[PDB]
Amino acid sequence: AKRTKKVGITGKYGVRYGSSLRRQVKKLEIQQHARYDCSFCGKKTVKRGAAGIWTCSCCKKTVAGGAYTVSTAAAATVRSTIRRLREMVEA
Amino acid sequence: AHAQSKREGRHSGYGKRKGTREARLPSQVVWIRRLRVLRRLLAKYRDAGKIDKHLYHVLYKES
Amino acid sequence: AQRVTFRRRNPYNTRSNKIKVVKTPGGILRAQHVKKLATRPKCGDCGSALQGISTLRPRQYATVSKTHKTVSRAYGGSRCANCVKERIIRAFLIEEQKIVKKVVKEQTEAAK
Amino acid sequence: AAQKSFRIKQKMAKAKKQNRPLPQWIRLRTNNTIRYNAKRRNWRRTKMNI
Amino acid sequence: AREITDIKQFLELTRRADVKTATVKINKKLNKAGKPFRQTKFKVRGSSSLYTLVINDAGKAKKLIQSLPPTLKVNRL
Amino acid sequence: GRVIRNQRKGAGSIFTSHTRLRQGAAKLRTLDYAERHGYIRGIVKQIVHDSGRGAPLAKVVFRDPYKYRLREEIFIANEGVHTGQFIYAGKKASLNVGNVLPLGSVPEGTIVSNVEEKPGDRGALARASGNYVIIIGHNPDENKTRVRLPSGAKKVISSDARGVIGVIAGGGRVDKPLLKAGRAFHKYRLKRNSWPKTRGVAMNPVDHPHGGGNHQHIGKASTISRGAVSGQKAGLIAARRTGLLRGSQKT
RNA sequence: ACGAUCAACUUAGAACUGGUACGGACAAGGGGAAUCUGACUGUCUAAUUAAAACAUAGCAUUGCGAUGGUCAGAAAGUGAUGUUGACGCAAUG
RNA sequence: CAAAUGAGAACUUUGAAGACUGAAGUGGGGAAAGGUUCCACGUCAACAGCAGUUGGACGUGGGUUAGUCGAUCCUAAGAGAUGGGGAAGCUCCGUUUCAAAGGCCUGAUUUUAUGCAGGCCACCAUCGAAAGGGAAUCCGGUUAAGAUUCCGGAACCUGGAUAUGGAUUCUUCACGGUAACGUAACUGAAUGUGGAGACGUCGGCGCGAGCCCUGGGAGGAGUUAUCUUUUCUUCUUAACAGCUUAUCACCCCGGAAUUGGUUUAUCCGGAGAUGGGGUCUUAUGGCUGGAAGAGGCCAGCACCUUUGCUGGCUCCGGUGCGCUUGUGACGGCCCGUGAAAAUCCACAGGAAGGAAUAGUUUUCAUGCCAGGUCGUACUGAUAACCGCAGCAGGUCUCCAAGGUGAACAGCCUCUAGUUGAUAGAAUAAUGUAGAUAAGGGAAGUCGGCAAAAUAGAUCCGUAACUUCGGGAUAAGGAUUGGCU
RNA sequence: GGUGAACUAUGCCUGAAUAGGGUGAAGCCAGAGGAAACUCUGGUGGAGGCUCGUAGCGGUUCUGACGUGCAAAUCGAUCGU
């Protein structure tokens, strides 16, 4: 059930551009074309429209996210620190 | 006359074929016909009651 | 096969220069110029295709009656039924919540 | 072009009117040395290029 | 360019006060293979539209042509 | 000689930005009265792609306080902002992602973006995708917030300068190789006419300081003085050092 | 456990047959072992050079936080980048 | 080849034959450009590198008909006044800028008006597309030459006035449906808001239009030494008006694991699937009207003469990975996500006004009037454009039959068009273009230059190396018709 | 001191054009082997600045024709895409 040993979605680039660059592109292309959970409706319906746009096809909600992921680690960390600062301020 | 002969089965041998098998008749078209026939048969059998929904579903996946 | 021609001086396959081939009572094939198809009006809230509203070009909407352009419900020809219902429920619910929060604030100020 | 402007069409009309040979009687007019129209034009020979 | 259904509609159309000309066209169509009948088309010409009433009964068509007023210009062809 | 490419780029004939498909200037809400005394609540209507811009833009609708009107502001979308979200802008706004609090009202260590360089300029700093500003400190006397910029520079800004909480969406964009002159072409086709880039060494001496020679070589030191003139400033302008450096952010 | 209209073009097989011919005209890859060189697709000396030259993605360096960098203008209450903001712009290899 | 015309014919006209273009045409039209080249009559001194009776030549004239096609209107990149600022200045910048920047609703409304103590607001001039955006027309006929422009018929839009019928009204501004929503109507200012305008590309799938193919039947033509219930050919239905017609979407009942439904493509369901029942968009098709009265195919009538008339028929189907076009629901791509404005409609709100022998409704039906200006002929190219020319060059686009075949190349043929390029005789060398060759097989040559060989499809088989994707059609073998 | 972007270079705006094949990427469905981990197979689908090759765009070689040319750059074959 696997037509390619290791190129995966980067089989479209054939033998061009170099194996390392194709490997990086493979990683980010799997992330960019993947389907994500919607935190609002709870279904795997969130797709990338353009770099940064992540639209849920079911609850019709657009989200601002990473270029190739709905959420980046930097965004999650920033959200954590902002929560910590907010609770320190409120209490 | 040649169309009647070709219906009868003449003038279609390896010397008369000049395009690939897929160029002549797409495997995708053949598969579409096959799958539509199978799905239509399964739906008709289920609506008639000859098979139940569960057997219909497993046969649908098999097809 | 009979071959047709543009009836206008525009020789290009632009979006406003679309033609169809039609048979005339004279028995010959002619080119009929077709106008751009009309897109269904959309809901202002959710953006879905509005139902019960006809699809015409914007000026074509001027010649039709009012019934063809709207629905008997509130926000009829503007917003869909589900969005109107959602905003009715929203309005009632959060105005009731406003009353509740006002009462709770007054009573906590009395307690204070 | 088929789709002309009125300025271009007016120039066309003026050119068509001017393109005609000498009336015969100017030749017989006295003290006359004009024998033909020396400003004659053909559409293939000289373009007025307006 | 507009059909008429009922004789009452035809009558209001013919008294509409802006129609003056009626054309009566005879079509020899077929209802069954062995029964070619006589179909009558009463065409009242209004200012904006051309109303046409189809009548498959010869008796009904005769009573129609007799009952329309003689002042209106009827043209049978 | 000849007028070189970097000299020609200032006349702005073919080198102006391609702005047809852009979605408007992304600016903060005008600092009127609510933004500096309380807060105002707007609603995120749509998050859209802006051509030539890696960050998404957010259209936010606010109520006009002085008239029965709706004002649509075009924001730089922060990561986590979604349609239907309520944005709060003002001095009294709370520390949440997407809000537009002033620097004086946010605490130390806050992540902010679309920060104003002066109070009222409607956003100048940390506007590219993935970029942010760190709040380092406050000086309440002659209120001045110290911040750290995306380049590592320490800046002192007024405490009344606005800024959106969070990081900018579209981050991690430059982690993907373009792989293709085609991808570079389509990138710059709606930014500006700056690609492809011919090397000066591959030109003639009429066309560039580097051009000419029987081999492709610069000839003189490629580090150019800051006091040089247009036509001379081609290479490494006012370079303090050169060569591959093993180093860190150092900030 | 099974019946009837409705002839649609694909595939495979078997004899038979002929001056062994049959993609019967047309249409239609020569192939292999290497060396030098440029990664590739792409571009240019219109009218003697299409290349190994240019470009390219990738890599690296440089300047600049806007009262700024780079560039324009005789000047300007003037401009390009810039509807821009370091994941950027500008300059190089 | 033969007639005709003519003083004169290889070249003009007509007839016959042979051919070609072969539907990304040598066909039918247009855009830029040209400018009368269009058409008729007369005519051949010059021009058509031979000729000429012919012509895009010469002479004389005729011809272009619009509310609906364009322009006109809008805005795009951009250009560009004003205010203001530079510059000795010609002028430069600037286009909402450090401006006191206007037009738009209803009353005032003939002691005076279009004044004003009525009211609303606050755009940045303007130009910029004959392929972008847009109000509305089709069929048949008609000329020597114009026609979506004329005529006949049948419609539509915009702007005006404007009465009648219908609807509503003592429950003042309608009712019905659980609902999606329906209907002939069914008040709606300021102000606000929302839609349409309004958008890439590719792929397969579905549907439709035309075309292609095909059966029966009703006419005409061809072939008929023999055969062929045969071959070719007509059997058409426009805009516009009503009824009907939909994938998608949505609503009601209901409450799902034994998970089911389901596409070619794997997505969808307790945020409510399956199932039953419905609502809407009208792409699109069907029926009727238009409309058989038209067009077309046939047969016959008064005997030179710019003359018509009368009879029939114009019908019923089928098929498909078919071609092309349009549409639909989808899927892929992007650090690329694929105009704006005029304009039109709608919604929120409720200003204002309104009864009864009559008010309102001109978003329901009917009825009345008008629609200006400029373009419109023709070519669009191996002769109408540019290249000094009637130049083997260059120059944007629409339609697109049969067979072979994978195939809009290659070959042949229908419709349509052309048969134009100075000719006659002969067949030396040397050439240009196309070929073949014994035996050898690169010995030729700077060098396999040039040519030859290979070649489609099916099956088998396929190495080193590799960035695991390729290499690869590697290499290397076999087969190929016709008939039953 | 003036005139040229009707050729051409580049950007922008608004339009238009591009048969038929080969290969067969992701996604998805079914099956087999295995104690398991997992591996393997058959389909489906239709990716690519992929490939053969029309129209198109270009211009490698013949150092072919021509070279007082059809032509102040064309013609034919062969070619690139």
UniProtKB/Swiss-Prot annotation, chain A:
The modification Phosphoserine is found at S39. It is found in: Cytoplasm. GO terms for cellular component: cytosol; cytosolic large ribosomal subunit. Component of the large ribosomal subunit (LSU). Mature yeast ribosomes consist of a small (40S) and a large (60S) subunit. The 40S small subunit contains 1 molecule of ribosomal RNA (18S rRNA) and 33 different proteins (encoded by 57 genes). The large 60S subunit contains 3 rRNA molecules (25S, 5.8S and 5S rRNA) and 46 different proteins (encoded by 81 genes). Pfam families: Ribosomal_L37ae. Signal peptide: none annotated. Belongs to the eukaryotic ribosomal protein eL43 family. GO terms for molecular function: structural constituent of ribosome; zinc ion binding. Component of the ribosome, a large ribonucleoprotein complex responsible for the synthesis of proteins in the cell. The small ribosomal subunit (SSU) binds messenger RNAs (mRNAs) and translates the encoded message by selecting cognate aminoacyl-transfer RNA (tRNA) molecules. The large subunit (LSU) contains the ribosomal catalytic site termed the peptidyl transferase center (PTC), which catalyzes the formation of peptide bonds, thereby polymerizing the amino acids delivered by tRNAs into a polypeptide chain. Present with 44600 molecules/cell in log phase SD medium. There are 2 genes for eL43 in yeast. InterPro entries: Ribosomal_eL37/eL43, Ribosomal_eL43, Ribosomal_protein_eL43, Ribosomal_zn-bd. The keyword Manganese does not apply. Gene3D superfamilies: 2.20.25.30. The gene is RPL43A. A zinc finger (C4-type) spans 38-59.
UniProtKB/Swiss-Prot annotation, chain B:
The modification Phosphoserine is found at S27. Residues 1-21 are annotated as: Disordered. It is found in: Cytoplasm. It comes from the Eukaryota. Coiled coil: none annotated. Present with 97700 molecules/cell in log phase SD medium. Component of the large ribosomal subunit (LSU). Mature yeast ribosomes consist of a small (40S) and a large (60S) subunit. The 40S small subunit contains 1 molecule of ribosomal RNA (18S rRNA) and 33 different proteins (encoded by 57 genes). The large 60S subunit contains 3 rRNA molecules (25S, 5.8S and 5S rRNA) and 46 different proteins (encoded by 81 genes). eL19 lies in close proximity to the binding site for eukaryotic initiation factor eIF4G. Component of the ribosome, a large ribonucleoprotein complex responsible for the synthesis of proteins in the cell. The small ribosomal subunit (SSU) binds messenger RNAs (mRNAs) and translates the encoded message by selecting cognate aminoacyl-transfer RNA (tRNA) molecules. The large subunit (LSU) contains the ribosomal catalytic site termed the peptidyl transferase center (PTC), which catalyzes the formation of peptide bonds, thereby polymerizing the amino acids delivered by tRNAs into a polypeptide chain. Belongs to the eukaryotic ribosomal protein eL19 family. This is Large ribosomal subunit protein eL19A. It comes from Saccharomyces cerevisiae (strain ATCC 204508 / S288c). The gene is RPL19A.
Curated annotation (Swiss-Prot), chain C:
GO terms for cellular component: cytosol; cytosolic large ribosomal subunit; preribosome, large subunit precursor. It is found in: Cytoplasm. It comes from the Eukaryota. Its main location: cytoplasm. GO terms for biological process: cytoplasmic translation; ribosome biogenesis. It holds the Pfam family Ribosomal_L34e. PROSITE patterns: RIBOSOMAL_L34E. InterPro entries: Ribosomal_eL34, Ribosomal_eL34_C_sf, Ribosomal_eL34_CS. GO terms for molecular function: structural constituent of ribosome. Component of the large ribosomal subunit (LSU). Mature yeast ribosomes consist of a small (40S) and a large (60S) subunit. The 40S small subunit contains 1 molecule of ribosomal RNA (18S rRNA) and 33 different proteins (encoded by 57 genes). The large 60S subunit contains 3 rRNA molecules (25S, 5.8S and 5S rRNA) and 46 different proteins (encoded by 81 genes). Component of the ribosome, a large ribonucleoprotein complex responsible for the synthesis of proteins in the cell. The small ribosomal subunit (SSU) binds messenger RNAs (mRNAs) and translates the encoded message by selecting cognate aminoacyl-transfer RNA (tRNA) molecules. The large subunit (LSU) contains the ribosomal catalytic site termed the peptidyl transferase center (PTC), which catalyzes the formation of peptide bonds, thereby polymerizing the amino acids delivered by tRNAs into a polypeptide chain. Present with 23600 molecules/cell in log phase SD medium. There are 2 genes for eL34 in yeast.
Swiss-Prot record, chain E:
Disulfide bonds: none annotated. InterPro entries: Ribosomal_eL38, Ribosomal_eL38_sf. GO terms for cellular component: cytoplasm; cytosol; cytosolic large ribosomal subunit. Coiled coil: none annotated. GO terms for molecular function: structural constituent of ribosome. GO terms for biological process: cytoplasmic translation; protein-RNA complex assembly. Its main location: cytoplasm. Keywords: Cytoplasm, Ribonucleoprotein, Ribosomal protein. It is found in: Cytoplasm. Component of the ribosome, a large ribonucleoprotein complex responsible for the synthesis of proteins in the cell. The small ribosomal subunit (SSU) binds messenger RNAs (mRNAs) and translates the encoded message by selecting cognate aminoacyl-transfer RNA (tRNA) molecules. The large subunit (LSU) contains the ribosomal catalytic site termed the peptidyl transferase center (PTC), which catalyzes the formation of peptide bonds, thereby polymerizing the amino acids delivered by tRNAs into a polypeptide chain. PANTHER family: 60S RIBOSOMAL PROTEIN L38, LARGE RIBOSOMAL SUBUNIT PROTEIN EL38. Belongs to the eukaryotic ribosomal protein eL38 family. Component of the large ribosomal subunit (LSU). Mature yeast ribosomes consist of a small (40S) and a large (60S) subunit. The 40S small subunit contains 1 molecule of ribosomal RNA (18S rRNA) and 33 different proteins (encoded by 57 genes). The large 60S subunit contains 3 rRNA molecules (25S, 5.8S and 5S rRNA) and 46 different proteins (encoded by 81 genes).
